[PDB]
Design a protein around this nucleic acid. Structure first.
Lengths: 190, 141, 203, 42, 108, 62, 174, 79, 293
RNA sequence: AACGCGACGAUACUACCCGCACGUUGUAGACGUAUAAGAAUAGGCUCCGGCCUCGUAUCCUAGCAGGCGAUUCCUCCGCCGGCCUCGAAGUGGCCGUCGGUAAUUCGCGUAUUGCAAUUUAGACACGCGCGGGAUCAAAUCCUUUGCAGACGACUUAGAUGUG
RNA sequence: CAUCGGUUCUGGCGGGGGGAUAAAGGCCCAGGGAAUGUGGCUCCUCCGGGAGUGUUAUAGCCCUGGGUGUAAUACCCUCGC
């Protein structure tokens, strides 16, 4: 079955500017500006109402209709990123060797870098380079905690996943060795 | 909440939309059968633009920018003809650039050998003044 | 249908097999064809299928001596297109050989083909042939993954060529504007009988 | 704000709606009448 | 001076003989006429005289140019390719060579 | 054993190149370049300013 | 199954001394021509009654033309078809302009979707849905919707196959 | 599976004449053996076939049931 | 059937064919990758092998067993008379590869490098580069300036032409060796200025290489002529009094295809192959004028 | 790649270059063998007014295979020279001279090739020519070497020298 | 080249007959009906439009019968040029 018309709607707050040109969405708000190329999905954008974006597919199959939900959630996440931001709080715990985490800003690349030392007594220094736009802060309120803040949910969550996956225990019982860095809390900055 | 979205704007097949068939005639859509076939009637006084009532495939039809306003769905030939002469579809079609191109094509294919020779000579005579004007423009600026 | 001295085809946006079939038929009919931008030809299907097919091609080789008789696997996109064309021409006959000498294939647009009109074939264009939603790949990416060494050089040369073409098209816009102004000015000096006769004749 | 919790923890996820591409093709009262007719028929 | 042409013939290309998948018949040749793409256009050129002009080696009777004459007999297929019969069958090396389709004998 | 074409060994070698052998080879390079720099130092058409034309084929001959 | 026409075929058993006036049996058969119509009549009549061609006669064959071929109608077709499993019912609907067009579309659709041929499809009933609420399948419930207006995105222009080379890249917006 | 980077030996779909002849002979023998087993089969087979019935989605199933009603009533009255 | 006891192949397939090298002088197949932020420098040189000798080295290798001890090592002596730069070759990038665009030579060329262009120098009129030497004089070297600015404008890789001073060696050969040495570092204009400043000037080895640096040596090996499989590939000798040769391979094939494979050990040319050896440490760059080097 | 390519040096000889002087010289096949944006195709172009299925378009297209003489026009084309410019297999722009030139109109000539017979006409390459300008070269055999080697092949050396 | 004969390919034109004396369809006449409910009225409103009402109104549609009508056309058969 091919459905003749299928539509989704996105409400837009007052402080958001959305510019779509050849399926390239540019969302700018108080915190910053994000861009995303959605040209790989056949979709027609329109202004159905004031502050309302309309997404429509004509003569599409069920897969083509279902793709609009992904596009809707992507644009909504961009709007939430430029309005409230995204914040991932991570906690690093240890049993015997205290894990040392250093955060600096590589200014030549314009991006933050995290150096992890003494992970279960290893002499190697693990290094994680952040995606641009993600800011790393060692939390002063709680103990042994990083905070990743940004406008791009994909960038912040991918940086968090990189920090988890660079600290993995190998050739040991994971029931006994609980060392590592884990994402404790996910939420919005504001 | 100001939003700047520019996108494509297709013409829409609907009740009242005028199609131009492959043979050059015109029809108005009165009923949509499916996404590939429509029911259309061309009740025009001009025999070149006239079309009998019947099924028109959308692959052999083109969407013209003329839409008959408030054409009832499934209207028969008398009602479609009344709406046609009321809205003046023939004059608007003659005004559109598609009919001008079709008329130009017919005028070019209706030429004889003497006609082509005269076209050549008159085009050279006009080209002389055009070349003089172009030379003056290029010399001035 | 028309007979030209030589036809220059732009390879961008074309399907490899359909373009190869059309080029092979025209070469056997007696037409000289130059195909440019073979790195921008398209193959239908997702890229891993084309990569797997070229690796299965690379697997085949003559066992007792790999320097003679074996399938010589060319990695350039122009030579990939040339192999596709040669598979559709009786290349072991004198007629097929003479048909193959009428073909030239290149990566990018080398001079003097940058100042020649590049035609397209609507029966092999990807945008007109493939259904939307289907996946496609590019011959240049496959060539770069299987061993072609000059992707970046062709890219820099194409950037220079397109900058020169942009300057040329600025000059072309100026010339077109001047021609339109010249026609508008000369409309007031041409004989009205001549203008009406041309309008009635369709010119 | 959102008064509930989400199991995956994606608190930014909107309140999604049911994927019903055949929506709006019939009305509720007509469906009730058809239900009564099918019950009598069976 | 006049800067025009002097062509009174339509260009064509000698494609192949009349053939199946394996068996070829050199008596009848196939010609693609320029601008002809269907049987309705080929019907106009049925009966016209088509000449193949080639160059020999020795000069015989004032020229080194030889002509093979023939006539277009019937259309072939649906794409305006025509069949022609010549005085002698055309050379097999001339597959893809150019032939001249005259405008005579004319019924206009 | 880890191979020569192993990602971890390549990363270790890249770190060694960037941090250790790099400055040494660099300083040797300025010393050698200065030494041989010492040896090295110790109309348009009619002047060559405009690069003019010097004093099979890509296209079909026609 | 070709350009189909609908035929009223009336036949009967041959009159004997025992039964001077045998019963007449009438069927509506979609067939390409009268020979196929009479053959299908004898097949279906052998499937129901003790009449065959050697013991019966064809009284009448009449073409049943559509009353209003210019009116777009919705048709419900109830049918049985043979698979490797056995006999199965299907009810389908088709939005067409005539019964013969609906039956031809049904034959093409059943061939495309279930690989059923003319030999293994029995047409039991073809009806016209006189009201809109009689429409049950969603693909025609979406066609009978109020104010049905849709565009035609990505229309490949009709270019002649004999014109091999074009000088500009075609547009897909008209 | 590492199939894209290193494909294995391809499986030929080009049929062998000997193989096709043997397969045709085996198919004919299987058809014959199935005919023999069908003739010698003692499993019960009903003479009557189960009626597939009328679909519920047919909108005039009520109306069909009505002319069935006066058809059987007229048949009983005539009988 | 299968081979019962596994054994690795004799010889490497990476050095096929085992033919004589196409040229006596070694070819630099690849140069070090050019970094434009680096200072301009030369990347290669030539010398002549004198011989070998023995040294005693005080080793400083932490973690080694011979740490803070004396080791005896074999070393090779290469005589390196200064090289004279007499040319400049420009290279451009094409989708077919690197292409030489033009070549600018020096005004005065020595008889050593002029002998390279001749096979019979004693019978010749020695006319080489005589008309080319006059384009330095006519129009104040306008053609030379044009070619140099062509290199500056269109080329990406710049190489000097340098020839050895073979008259300072004890060799009886008087024909010098000429090669292209790529300038690495800087921009193309800097490379061309560097080359023109280096025309007609001798360049010593200590301005190209330094002590404690690891380099590569490219040459042609010692030729051995036609040599059988036992010494050419290291195959196991057949037992004593094996019929028809015991310094042979018993089976050049026992399996399909009905051919001899390219991977089977066969008798042929051994030695005189072109080889590039890497990671050779320079231990001392001694000076000729020193009487205690 | 021994039937892939580039740069460079010297090039005796009829050999090299320039001009016209033509070919019973050769070419998978001239006949207007005319035409450069790029990019997207669920979007583009613009002169910013608007335009977009459409190359069915644009340019060129008349004259003994295209003369002579005017009337008339400052339009188009070509060869040279200058200055710039074009390296992906290198070529175009402007200016200046010169030559030709129906955009309008007219006169004188066309015949006889006899009612059709390719309309012998283009481009590239090659050779024979003359009339001029330019330049006086190498390789191999032989002797020798042993960095090499079955033999060829290869590294050398042999003309006044550091032989 | 013209006029012909035999064989054959292809294009166009003028007629005749048949069916439900095609079925449609247009213009009128007489009834009946419904919504994917027109105008009007009412209620919400972002006032852009929706929702309710009922059978033509300031759009129309469907069903039945009759006249033009032996209408035209499609399809099939056929007589010729």
């Amino acid at each position: 079955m091919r459905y003749i018309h299928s539509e989704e709607t996105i409400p837009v707050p007052e402080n958001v500017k959305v510019s779509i040109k050849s399926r390239l969405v540019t969302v700018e708000g108080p915190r910053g500006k994000l861009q995303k190329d959605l040209s790989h999905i056949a979709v027609n954008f329109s202004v159905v109402k004031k502050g309302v974006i309309g997404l429509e597919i004509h003569h599409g199959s069920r897969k083509d209709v279902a793709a609009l939900r992904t596009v809707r959630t992507i644009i909504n996440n961009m709007i939430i990123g430029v309005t409230k931001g995204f914040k991932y709080k991570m906690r690093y715990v240890y049993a015997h060797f205290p894990i040392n985490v250093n955060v600096e800003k590589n200014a030549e690349t314009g991006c933050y870098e995290v150096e992890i030392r003494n992970f279960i007594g290893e002499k190697i220094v693990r290094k994680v380079v952040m995606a641009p736009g993600v800011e790393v802060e060692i939390s002063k309120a709680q103990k042994d905690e990083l905070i990743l803040s940004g406008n791009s949910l994909e960038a912040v969550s991918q940086s968090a996943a990189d920090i988890q996956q660079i600290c993995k225990v190998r050739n040991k019982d994971i029931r006994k060795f609980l060392d590592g860095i884990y994402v404790s809390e996910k939420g919005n900055i504001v | 909440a100001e939003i700047n979205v520019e996108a494509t704007s297709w013409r829409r097949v609907e009740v009242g939309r005028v199609l131009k068939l492959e043979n050059g005639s015109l029809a108005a859509i009165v009923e949509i059968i499916d996404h590939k076939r429509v029911l259309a009637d061309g009740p025009s006084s001009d025999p070149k633009l006239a079309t009998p009532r019947g099924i028109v495939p959308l692959s052999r039809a083109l969407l013209t920018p003329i839409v008959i306003p408030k054409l009832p769905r499934g209207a028969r030939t008398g009602a479609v003809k009344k709406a046609w002469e009321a809205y003046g579809v023939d004059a608007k079609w003659k005004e559109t650039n598609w009919a001008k191109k079709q008329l130009q094509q017919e005028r070019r294919q209706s030429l004889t050998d003497f006609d082509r020779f005269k076209v050549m000579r008159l085009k050279k005579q006009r080209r002389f003044e055009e070349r003089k004007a172009l030379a003056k423009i290029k010399a001035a600026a | 249908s028309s007979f030209e001295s030589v036809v220059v085809i732009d390879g961008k946006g074309h399907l490899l097999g359909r373009l190869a079939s059309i080029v092979a038929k025209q070469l056997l009919s007696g037409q000289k064809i130059v195909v440019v931008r073979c790195e921008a030809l398209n193959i239908s299907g997702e890229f891993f299928r084309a990569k797997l097919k070229y690796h299965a091609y690379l697997r085949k080789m003559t066992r007792y001596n790999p320097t003679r008789g074996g399938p010589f696997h060319f990695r350039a996109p122009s030579r990939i297109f040339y192999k596709a064309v040669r598979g559709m021409i009786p290349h072991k006959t004198a007629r097929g050989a003479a048909a193959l000498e009428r073909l030239k294939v290149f990566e990018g647009v080398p001079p003097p083909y940058d100042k020649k009109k590049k035609m397209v074939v609507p029966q092999a264009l990807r945008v007109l042939r493939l259904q939307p939603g289907r996946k496609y790949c590019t011959v240049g990416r496959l060539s770069h993954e299987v061993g072609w060494k000059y992707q970046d050089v062709v890219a820099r040369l194409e950037e220079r060529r397109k900058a020169k073409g942009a300057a040329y098209y600025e000059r072309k816009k100026l010339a077109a504007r001047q021609l339109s102004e010249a026609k508008k000015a000369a409309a007031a000096k041409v004989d009205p009988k001549v203008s009406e006769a041309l309008a009635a004749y369709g010119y | 704000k959102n008064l509930g919790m989400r199991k995956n923890g994606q608190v930014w996820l909107p309140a999604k709606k049911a994927f019903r591409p055949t929506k709006g093709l019939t009305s509720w009262e007509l469906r009730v009448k058809k239900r009564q007719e099918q019950a009598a028929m069976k | 001076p006049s800067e025009a042409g002097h062509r009174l013939y339509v260009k064509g290309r000698h494609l192949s003989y009349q053939r199946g998948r394996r068996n070829t018949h050199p008596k009848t040749s196939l010609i693609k006429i320029e601008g002809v793409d269907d049987t309705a256009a080929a019907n106009f050129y049925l009966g016209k005289r088509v000449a193949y002009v080639y160059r020999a080696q020795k000069e015989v009777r004032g020229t080194k140019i030889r002509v093979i004459w023939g006539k277009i007999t019937r259309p072939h297929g649906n794409s305006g390719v025509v069949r022609a019969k010549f005085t002698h069958p055309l050379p097999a090396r001339s597959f893809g060579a150019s032939v001249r389709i005259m405008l005579y004998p004319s019924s206009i | 054993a880890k191979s020569a074409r192993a990602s971890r060994i390549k990363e270790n070698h890249q770190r060694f190149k960037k941090n250790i052998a790099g400055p040494v080879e660099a300083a040797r390079l300025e010393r050698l370049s200065a030494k041989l720099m010492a040896i090295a130092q110790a109309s348009g058409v009619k002047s060559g300013k405009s690069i003019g034309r010097k004093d099979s084929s890509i296209v079909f001959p026609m | 199954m070709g350009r189909l026409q609908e035929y009223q075929v009336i036949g009967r058993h041959l009159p004997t001394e025992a039964n001077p006036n045998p019963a007449l049996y009438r069927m509506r058969i979609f067939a390409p021509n009268e020979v196929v119509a009479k053959s299908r009549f004898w097949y279906f009549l052998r499937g129901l009654k003790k009449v065959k061609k050697a013991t019966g006669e064809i009284v009448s064959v009449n073409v049943i033309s559509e009353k209003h071929p210019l009116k777009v109608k919705n048709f419900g077709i109830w049918l049985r078809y043979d698979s490797r499993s056995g006999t199965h019912n299907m009810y389908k609907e088709y939005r067409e302009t005539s019964r013969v067009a609906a039956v031809e579309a049904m034959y093409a659709d059943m061939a495309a979707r279930h690989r059923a041929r003319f030999r293994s499809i029995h047409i039991l009933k073809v009806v016209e849905l006189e009201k809109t609420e009689d429409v049950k399948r969603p693909y025609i419930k979406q066609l009978v919707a109020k104010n049905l207006s849709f565009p035609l995105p990505h229309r490949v222009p009709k270019i002649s196959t004999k014109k091999i080379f074009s000088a500009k890249r075609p547009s897909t917006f008209s | 599976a590492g199939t894209i980077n290193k494909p294995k030996k391809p499986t030929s779909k080009r049929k062998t004449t000997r193989l096709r002849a043997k397969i045709s002979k085996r198919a004919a023998e299987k058809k014959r053996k199935e005919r023999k087993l069908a003739r010698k089969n003692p499993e019960w087979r009903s003479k009557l076939k189960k009626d597939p019935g009328i679909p519920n989605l047919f909108p005039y199933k009520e109306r069909l049931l009505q002319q069935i009603e006066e058809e059987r009533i007229r048949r009983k009255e005539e009988l | 059937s299968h081979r019962k006891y596994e054994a690795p192949r004799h010889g490497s397939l990476a050095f096929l064919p085992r033919k004589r090298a196409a040229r006596h002088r070694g070819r630099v197949k690849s140069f070090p990758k050019d970094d434009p932020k680096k200072p301009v420098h030369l990347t290669a040189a030539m010398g002549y092998k004198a011989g070998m000798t023995t040294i005693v080295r005080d080793l400083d290798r932490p973690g080694a067993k011979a740490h803070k001890k004396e080791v005896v090592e074999a070393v090779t002596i290469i005589d390196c008379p200064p090289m004279v730069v007499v040319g400049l070759v420009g290279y451009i990038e094409t989708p077919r590869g690197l292409r030489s665009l033009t070549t600018v030579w020096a005004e005065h060329l020595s008889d050593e490098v002029k002998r390279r262009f001749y096979k019979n120098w004693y019978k010749s009129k020695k006319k080489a580069f005589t008309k080319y030497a006059k384009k330095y004089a006519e129009n104040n070297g306008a053609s030379i300036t044009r070619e140099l600015e062509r290199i500056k404008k269109y080329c990406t890789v710049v190489r000097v032409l340098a020839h050895t001073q073979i008259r300072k060696t004890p060799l009886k050969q008087k024909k010098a060796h000429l090669m292209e040495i790529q300038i690495n570092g800087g921009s193309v204009a800097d490379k061309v200025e560097f080359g023109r400043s280096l025309f007609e000037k001798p360049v010593t080895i200590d301005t190209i290489f330094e002590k404690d640096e690891m380099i590569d040596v490219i040459a042609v090996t010692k030729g051995h002529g036609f040599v059988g499989v036992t010494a050419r590939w290291g195959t196991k000798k057949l037992p004593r009094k094996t019929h028809k040769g015991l310094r042979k391979v018993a089976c050049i094939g026992a399996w399909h295809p009905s051919h001899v494979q390219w991977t089977v050990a066969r008798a042929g040319q051994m030695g005189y192959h072109h080889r590039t050896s890497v990671n050779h440490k320079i231990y001392r760059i001694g000076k000729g004028d020193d009487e205690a080097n």
